[PDB]
Design a protein around this ligand. Structure first.
Ligand code: NA
Length: 169
């Protein structure tokens, strides 16, 4: 609908779109896809810094098949930090990667096996109708971003998680 399309555009308008339909086994086409992935990620990060919302770091192994980093979330002037990681599915970019936040695994009934976060029923269709334009920057912006803004406040209220540090120090 009009609202979904507009809401998606608002979030990802200045994130570079990806082109190459290639997964981790596609050799020279995967190398090109990885270039588009890094191009998109770094511009997203650069845009986030200018918006005082620099909220994650990601790096990959040599092959670009395993990604890892951290995300940060600010709530009531306290800063929360979480390790994140995912593997690239063989059928990516058609199949979205599954984000794990391993330190929350077994610790909350929000986690699937391997500390994998549950995105909403609307994430997979949204990803599906954008293949192959969406990449890891879009997984962060449209998947993990909204997840932090729902689930982290909830875990703080339930007293499941503690902070790392105060904000403006
Ligand atoms: Na979850």
């Amino acid at each position: 609908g009009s609202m979904a399309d507009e809401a998606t555009r608002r979030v990802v308008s200045e994130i570079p779109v990806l082109k190459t339909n290639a997964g981790p086994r596609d050799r020279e086409l995967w190398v090109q896809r990885l270039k588009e992935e890094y191009q998109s990620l770094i511009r997203y990060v650069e845009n986030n810094k200018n918006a005082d919302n620099d909220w994650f770091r990601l790096e990959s192994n040599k092959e670009g098949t395993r990604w890892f980093g951290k995300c940060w979330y600010i709530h009531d002037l306290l800063k929360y930090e979480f390790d994140i990681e995912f593997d690239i599915p063989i059928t990516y970019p058609t199949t979205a990667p599954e984000i794990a936040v391993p330190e929350l695994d077994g610790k909350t009934a929000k986690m699937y096996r391997g500390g994998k976060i549950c995105l909403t029923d609307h994430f997979k269709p949204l990803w599906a109708r954008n293949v192959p334009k969406f990449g890891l920057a879009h997984l962060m912006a449209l998947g993990l971003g909204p997840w932090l803004a729902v689930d982290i406040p909830d875990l703080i209220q339930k007293g499941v998680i503690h902070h790392k540090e105060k904000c403006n120090q």
